[PDB]
Design a protein around this ligand. Structure first.
Ligand SMILES: *[C@@H]1O[C@H](CO)[C@@H](O[C@@H]2O[C@H](CO)[C@@H](O[C@@H]3O[C@H](CO)[C@@H](O)[C@H](O)[C@@H]3O)[C@H](O)[C@H]2NC(C)=O)[C@H](O)[C@H]1NC(C)=O
Ligand SMILES: *[C@@H]1O[C@H](CO)[C@@H](O[C@@H]2O[C@H](CO)[C@@H](O[C@@H]3O[C@H](CO)[C@@H](O)[C@H](O)[C@@H]3O)[C@H](O)[C@H]2NC(C)=O)[C@H](O)[C@H]1NC(C)=O
Ligand SMILES: CC(C)CCC[C@@H](C)[C@H]1CC[C@H]2[C@@H]3CC=C4C[C@@H](OC(=O)CCC(=O)O)CC[C@]4(C)[C@H]3CC[C@]12C
Ligand SMILES: CC(C)CCC[C@@H](C)[C@H]1CC[C@H]2[C@@H]3CC=C4C[C@@H](OC(=O)CCC(=O)O)CC[C@]4(C)[C@H]3CC[C@]12C
Ligand SMILES: CC(C)CCC[C@@H](C)[C@H]1CC[C@H]2[C@@H]3CC=C4C[C@@H](OC(=O)CCC(=O)O)CC[C@]4(C)[C@H]3CC[C@]12C
Ligand SMILES: CC(C)CCC[C@@H](C)[C@H]1CC[C@H]2[C@@H]3CC=C4C[C@@H](OC(=O)CCC(=O)O)CC[C@]4(C)[C@H]3CC[C@]12C
Ligand SMILES: CCOC(=O)c1ncn2c1CN(C)C(=O)c1cc(F)ccc1-2
Ligand SMILES: *[C@@H]1O[C@H](CO)[C@@H](O)[C@H](O)[C@H]1NC(C)=O
Ligand SMILES: *[C@@H]1O[C@H](CO)[C@@H](O)[C@H](O)[C@H]1NC(C)=O
Lengths: 116, 337, 333, 106, 333, 333, 106, 116
């Protein structure tokens, strides 16, 4: 139902781009969220995008470090990080809104590792 | 030219049966709602109703209206709204509402290339909210507005909000025209109502209101306080000058009676006991007890004047203490809430 | 001839699609509005609304209605207005309006050889303008009327008056019963809503109050009641019941004046100016009554003190009262 | 920003015992809290959407009770594989999540 | 059978949008009014209701036929299909065309082609008033009607009969609570506005106010209380408290009477003619009170000047009172 | 059967020309009217109108609608009311009337085998009748309801009740709160207007006011104050201030009661009876005060004159008052 | 009945001079007067109908002024042919005509 | 547009004379007809008014019962009939038509009636 890229290892200070491909529906109807999860910690919200108008909302603490852009023809969302340090090494998920504003469907997830 | 668009439109409306909803045998039709309040009308306590002026917006996906053309977004005239399907949305507790028809029916129809219909009206909604006037005039109550679909169960039509719910009901800054109350905030909620026919989805929106006290400060409280102080002042004058003190005691009670008449005029009839009524009853009781004390002193002066002078001095030193104590207790009790 | 015009109109309206406005694909259409005010019936503070009647005229160029055989300016019946396209235009802050239907729906449709359609209505609008009564009665109101296209964004429709100096007429002849017109202005704006950007026209005229009639009815009674305190001061110190009764009468009369004026004034929560004036006069007569109560209470000790206090008050009050009135009238004007 | 407090931190109960987890919201959130289940090394799943509503394909043992600011997830007969992390997240505003609760067999 | 053919043949090839003779000569419409009952005039809003029958007749060349009837009385239903001149009332606040059980519109077709078209209407017209002579005022309220969307070149109004005999009022129906209908006047004019030159028919109804009520309403209590203030002089100067009460009672009665009179008086910026009489009637009592106060002051030092002031006031007050009454009642009537 | 009725209705409505009334070239078609009054809501003196709710029923013979196949009485859905012919009937003096529509528009169409058609409405009418309030409150009203035809002259239509005794029903059950019914009459007439002679019916019923209520509310306070004013005479002429207290308080109370009763009663700006009565009592107490003032003036010279005048007043005043009351109540009742 | 008065009775004016004729009505007439020009031994023609309206085919030198009960016909440039009788007749009621004015060249 | 009248008439006292005016260029049924007599060297004086629609005729109260006006719509003519003539009745007679605010625009050439 949802597809993501494999694990990605990057050197500190270099931007990286992650992809989330939907299958079985058109994202022009619903939003697309992005969530990050550090090892053995609570979930955290990165931001959401509305493919209809292209408007995006970000968590202020993550503002300016991530950009979310969508392509309707390929039916895909793209999360491009900024210069990331060794701190933000965690898993990422893309989610779709549900019936009562619950993120029901989630991708398998991708692990972004930072090493020198 | 326009002939291309006319042919597109006629091919589109051909075979479109408005009695059926979109996607009958398939998934349920999902409608997205939004409310923009242009102005919050006067809230009438006597009828317990509030008027509101809204820009009701709805959006729903429909498969049959998709087309392939150069325009890619069609802003159509208002009169086309009656031919396509339109979900019925009746406010559950609206006493009487009116859709404006100023120079053309206030409706806008916007058809996208995908088939995502947008349809908005302008409404003046007059809705009832029950109130608890026990804490009057220190009351703070919330007036609701609940709208849901008609003739369609939850199995067939489900309502949702277009944006994050907190930012769905949007109120204009200068739109608020409230003479007396004051607007604090807005809240939204989704719910399901079960009835004899079936289950129906219902959107609820609460508008929180609070009442300004400045009017009633100088309206009734200050007159009664001034009257209590005046009627108590009469105890200092000499007991020999009888007619002056009698006129004093009569005028105080008459002014109190007029004040009570006005206070009863203030609010619609209720079984409750309002706080202002409590305060005025105590104020009247105090002035009446003072008059009774003066009367008994004037009757007692002949038998034993020394006890009368002692009674006068004791009343002087006793009455303002109890009055101020009660005022402090009452004001603290109803302000802490 | 007659048959020429008959066949021309019949072939114009045939094959004419009402759903789509002129120039659907390309540039936006141009609409010019020309208000003509007939009268402002009533301006109510209780509801804060002002009824007004107007002839409302819109002119725009429609290409599909272009004819060249007849040189006359065709003036079709009003019924034809249900078939031609007409721009939807709603007032923003109206509560209740209705087109007059005395004999027919009063709309005028006037065509032109090049297609400059002219469309006219006679509308009675009850609009609501927020009024500030802090400075009542000496107050200035700024009541407006707002016009917006409800269904077409600025990419589709345009609004402009047909000559600003001659955009709105008939304001001079208006003779309001209570207020007085001062000035009117015409503004063109673009308002941004959630769905798009929409054009807007604004017509706003000031309103000044006629302080002349309003002073005479209310401001004199307070002075007349306050003079009673001085008259009481000019009483011999021996008489007590009479002056005490005069003071109590002044207090009761001030209270009754406040109540009656409130029963006659437009009811609003926030405190007004005339309320401050009445409160000042009430405080003055109350202080006079308390002063004479003190005089009567300390009279048995020494009458020289009583006469001294009487003289002090007689030389004290008429100056403080005039100073208060000076500050009052210099602050509210 | 709305903050959620989830209690208790971690708990260890045996098979067949009733279990109750509580979620507290600082600000107002009206019947929009959802409850997600996440097993180790798997993507989270949705258990309860809204309040007292079960997503399709979830056993009937899970129940939820809601209010203005208090929320409760209740399990009756608890199977062996039902131990996993549970998160209560609200979406009344920009969505946020609680700390999370890890459930382990004793 | 035959009438169905005669009737369908007319409407065949008939287009309602075009008035008769579009390129031909101007159309001349004749008008007549029958005022069934003259509604109650109001003073607070300056509006009067009226109930009318409204008859119009024009010569339409296309509807001529030949048949055995020579006059067709048709149902109201066919009124919508033929052309119908739009005649609107230039100063109607909100009229209503009655449709009790079927639309009250009668249409008659003559064999030559002279249509006849009558309606029943209720019109709430507005007439500005001038109350400087209240309650002796006599004013005329106008009713002006004209065409809409037709210049002088296209439609011209005339009176069906001699203009003095056109507007006919029913004798029994005319009901006025307060005023009294006097006469009717008609006029024809040309009014120029932004769109063009329109012909306007004007009808003034004259009104005169009844006075029998305000005599025993306000004027008589004022005169009686003034005469009581005069009698106040005759009282023995010894009973000083009784004289003070006698003086205060007149002032209290004047206050109550003045408030009662203000309650009914219509709110206008002008100073009504009754308010001057009220001011004089209210000032004479204060003059008598001032005289009594000066007597109470003078009595201690000198009795001679007290007696002289009493005598002179007695011989002086009623003379000026009567002179003023004569002037007031002579000026207005 | 179903199909027989279906095809019968279809063949009736086919080839039906609505705008042609039955028997177009022949004699007039009789129309019988029948009224069932449910209630009379309110009867106001301020606006001079009364509200009624009724069932209106018209029966007319029509040769076109006639069938011999089915003996049943067909009753059609009210939607058919537009397709058939219906006689137009307007109430001459209604100000605002509307047909009740709750679930559908309340009207019934009932055919018959011989062709008689029955057509029924449910109407609420705010009719207007002139009220003569000279003898208010004790008066009799003759409020009416006038029915006419607006389209067809007396040559084409005839109006008559279906049994004069049983035409109007439900009148006995009518219970006005403040009035009570006495009698009603039915009239048939022809009225000449400038376009012809039109038939008409009139339903007119009397209204009598209940005297019992107004007495206790209005007349008792004035009479009590007038009688209590007489206690002034029994006091000895030495106590001047005491007697002047009553002589003043009576007049002040009379003025206050007059103002209150003016505020309460329905405002009508012309002379009525209760005003005459209150003015009489006011004049009586005023004359009592005047005679005592004159006594107090001429007292110092001769006391015997004062005692004689007191005796004369005691023996004369109640007799004059009783004579006045007797003449009043005999002239009115 | 409504009666008209015309002034002056007979006046003589030279060529090129402004001439004024006045018509006073006893009752009220609301601008329904008309002016007729009658040459010797001919049929009266129409010059001004109503108030200040010129009949077709009439020179512009003729002007009319009207009021409630006062009406005036004004001639500017005057020629030889312009001399003839003039009548002011009102049609507000049953029509009647004034006495008439005779105008002769000097 | 044009009005035609009969020739001059000579009649002895005590007899009746009839005058008729014919209108060409318009139907009489539309507008009214006015008859006005004028004595030599005196002001115009109105006689009567007739309406072809209803046949209603109004007369100057001094002439009521002395003259009778009739219309024949078939022949499109108007007819005035006088009775009980005297030597003072000799005057010229004019037949006119009203229009454009009751102007009485078109008059006939004029008929002369002499009593001897
Ligand atoms: C009554 O209130 C209205 C609005 O409440 C006032 O209208 C405002 O008038 C000002 C001018 O004094 C406008 O400012 C204008 O800005 C444009 C921007 O390009 C420019 O042309 C000038 O700088 C001009 O100052 C303002 O846009 C307009 N509307 C608002 C504020 O919403 C009005 O002036 C008040 N008074 C009267 C007598 O109407
Ligand atoms: C209320 O006022 C109406 C209005 O006049 C009164 O109606 C009148 O009633 C009388 C008696 O029914 C009518 O007299 C009739 O005269 C004809 C003449 O031929 C005679 O044949 C009848 O037998 C009857 O006597 C009178 O015409 C009628 N008024 C009018 C204008 O027609 C009515 O009586 C008053 N009272 C009530 C209780 O309605
Ligand atoms: C008189 C002074 C003393 C108390 C003052 C009041 C104190 C509290 C308020 C409530 C406030 O809201 C408006 C001003 C007001 C009425 C003040 C008005 C001026 C007052 C009446
Ligand atoms: C004002 C009236 C009410 C009380 C009257 C006073 C009552 C007592 C006295 C004292 C007496 O010595 C002189 C008259 C006087 C001033 C009276 C003057 C007229 C007064 C002031
Ligand atoms: C008291 C006498 C003197 C003047 C008379 C009034 C003179 C004029 C009229 C107007 C008239 O109408 C009614 C009678 C009335 C009030 C008279 C009622 C009896 C009055 C008031
Ligand atoms: C007012 C009329 C009705 C009763 C009349 C009174 C009847 C008795 C007397 C007593 C008599 O001695 C003097 C006249 C007088 C006052 C009359 C004056 C004129 C009065 C007051
Ligand atoms: C008792 C019969 O009741 C009805 O026939 C009925 N008709 C409409 N509805 C009902 C049920 N009912 C009591 C409602 O309140 C309601 C609530 C909804 F949300 C939607 C429809 C309805
Ligand atoms: C039609 O209107 C235009 C607009 O002013 C004007 O110029 C033109 O003369 C009019 N046509 C006629 C025939 O008057
Ligand atoms: C139909 O109505 C008439 C009315 O008089 C009645 O006589 C007849 O019996 C009715 N028909 C039936 C079948 O009841």
């Amino acid at each position: 139902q949802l597809q993501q890229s494999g694990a990605e290892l990057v050197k500190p200070g270099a931007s990286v781009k992650l992809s989330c491909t939907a299958s079985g529906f058109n994202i022009k109807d619903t939003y697309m969220y992005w969530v990050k999860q550090r090892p053995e910690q609570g979930l955290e919200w990165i931001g959401r995008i509305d493919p209809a108008n292209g408007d995006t909302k970000y968590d202020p603490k993550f503002q300016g470090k991530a950009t979310i852009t969508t392509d309707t023809f390929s039916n895909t969302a793209y999360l491009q990080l900024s210069s990331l340090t060794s701190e933000d090494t965690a898993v990422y998920y893309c989610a779709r809104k549900g019936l009562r504003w619950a993120m029901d469907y989630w991708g398998q997830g991708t692990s972004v590792t930072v090493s020198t | 030219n326009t002939t291309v668009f006319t042919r597109i439109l006629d091919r589109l409306l051909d075979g479109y049966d408005n009695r059926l909803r979109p996607g009958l045998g398939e998934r349920v039709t999902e409608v997205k709602t939004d409310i923009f309040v242009t102005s919050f009308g006067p809230v009438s306590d006597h009828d317990m109703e509030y008027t509101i002026d809204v820009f009701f917006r709805q959006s729903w996906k429909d498969e049959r209206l998709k087309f392939k053309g150069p325009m890619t977004v069609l802003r159509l005239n208002n009169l086309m709204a009656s031919k396509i399907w339109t979900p019925d949305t009746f406010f559950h507790n609206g006493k009487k509402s009116v859709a404006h028809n100023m120079t053309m029916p206030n409706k806008l129809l916007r058809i996208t290339e995908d088939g995502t219909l947008l349809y908005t009206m302008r409404l003046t909604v007059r809705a009832e909210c029950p109130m608890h006037l026990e804490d009057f005039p220190m009351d703070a109550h919330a007036c609701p507005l609940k709208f849901g679909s008609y003739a369609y169960t939850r199995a067939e039509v489900v309502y949702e909000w277009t944006r994050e719910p907190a930012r769905s009901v949007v109120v204009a800054e200068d739109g608020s025209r409230l003479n007396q109350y004051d607007l604090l905030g807005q809240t939204v909620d989704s719910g399901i109502v079960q009835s004899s026919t079936g289950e129906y989805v219902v959107m609820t929106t609460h508008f929180h209101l609070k009442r300004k006290i400045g009017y009633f400060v100088i309206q009734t409280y200050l007159p009664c306080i001034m009257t209590v102080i005046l009627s108590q002042v009469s105890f200092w004058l000499n007991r020999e000058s009888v007619p002056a003190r009698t006129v004093f005691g009569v005028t105080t009670v008459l002014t109190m009676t007029t004040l009570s008449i006005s206070a009863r005029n203030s609010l619609p009839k209720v079984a409750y006991a309002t706080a202002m009524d409590w305060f005025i009853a105590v104020c009247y009781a105090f002035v009446f007890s003072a008059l009774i004390e003066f009367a008994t002193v004037n009757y007692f002066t002949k038998s034993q004047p020394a006890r009368a002078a002692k009674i006068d001095r004791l009343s002087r030193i006793a009455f303002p203490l109890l009055f101020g104590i009660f005022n402090l207790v009452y004001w603290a009790t109803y302000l802490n809430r | 001839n007659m048959s020429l015009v008959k066949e021309t109109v019949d072939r114009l309206l045939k094959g004419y699609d009402i759903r789509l406005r002129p120039d659907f694909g390309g540039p936006p259409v141009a609409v010019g509005m020309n208000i003509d005010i007939a009268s402002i019936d009533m301006v109510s503070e209780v509801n804060m609304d002002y009824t007004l009647t107007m002839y409302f005229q819109q002119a725009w160029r429609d290409k599909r209605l272009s004819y060249n055989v007849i040189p006359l300016n065709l003036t079709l019946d009003n019924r034809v207005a249900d078939q031609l396209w007409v721009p939807d235009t709603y007032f923003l802050n109206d509560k209740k309006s209705f087109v007059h239907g005395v004999t027919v729906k009063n709309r005028m449709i006037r065509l032109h050889p090049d297609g400059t359609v002219l469309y006219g209505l006679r509308i009675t609008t009850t609009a609501a303008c927020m009024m500030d009564l802090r400075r009542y009665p000496l107050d200035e109101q700024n009541c407006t009327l707002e016009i917006e296209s409800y269904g077409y964004t600025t990419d589709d429709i345009e609004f402009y008056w047909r000559g600003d100096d001659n955009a709105v007429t008939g304001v001079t002849k208006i003779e309001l019963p209570q207020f007085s017109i001062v000035d009117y202005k015409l503004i063109t704006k673009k308002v941004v809503f959630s769905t798009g950007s929409y054009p807007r026209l604004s017509l706003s005229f000031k309103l000044k109050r006629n302080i002349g009639y309003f002073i005479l009815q209310t401001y004199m009674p307070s002075i007349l009641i306050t003079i009673l305190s001085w008259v009481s001061f000019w009483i011999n110190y021996d008489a007590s019941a009479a002056r005490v009764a005069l003071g109590i009468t002044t207090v009761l009369t001030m209270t009754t004046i406040n109540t009656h004026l409130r029963e006659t004034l437009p009811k609003i929560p926030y405190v007004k100016a005339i309320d401050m004036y009445l409160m000042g006069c009430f405080v003055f007569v109350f202080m006079a009554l308390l002063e004479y109560a003190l005089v009567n209470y300390i009279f048995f000790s020494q009458p020289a003190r009583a006469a001294a206090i009487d003289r002090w008050s007689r030389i004290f009050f008429p100056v403080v009262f005039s100073f208060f009135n000076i500050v009052y009238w210099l602050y509210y004007v | 920003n709305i903050v959620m407090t989830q209690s208790p931190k971690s708990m260890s109960m045996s098979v067949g015992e009733r279990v109750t987890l509580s979620c507290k919201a600082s600000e107002y959130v009206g019947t929009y809290v959802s409850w997600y289940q996440q097993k180790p090394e798997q993507s989270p799943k949705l258990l309860i959407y809204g309040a007292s509503n079960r997503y399709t394909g979830v056993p009937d043992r899970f129940t939820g009770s809601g209010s203005a600011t208090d929320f409760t997830l209740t399990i009756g007969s608890v199977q062996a594989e039902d131990l996993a992390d549970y998160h209560c997240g609200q979406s009344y505003s920009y969505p946020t999540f609680g700390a999370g609760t890890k459930l382990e067999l004793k």
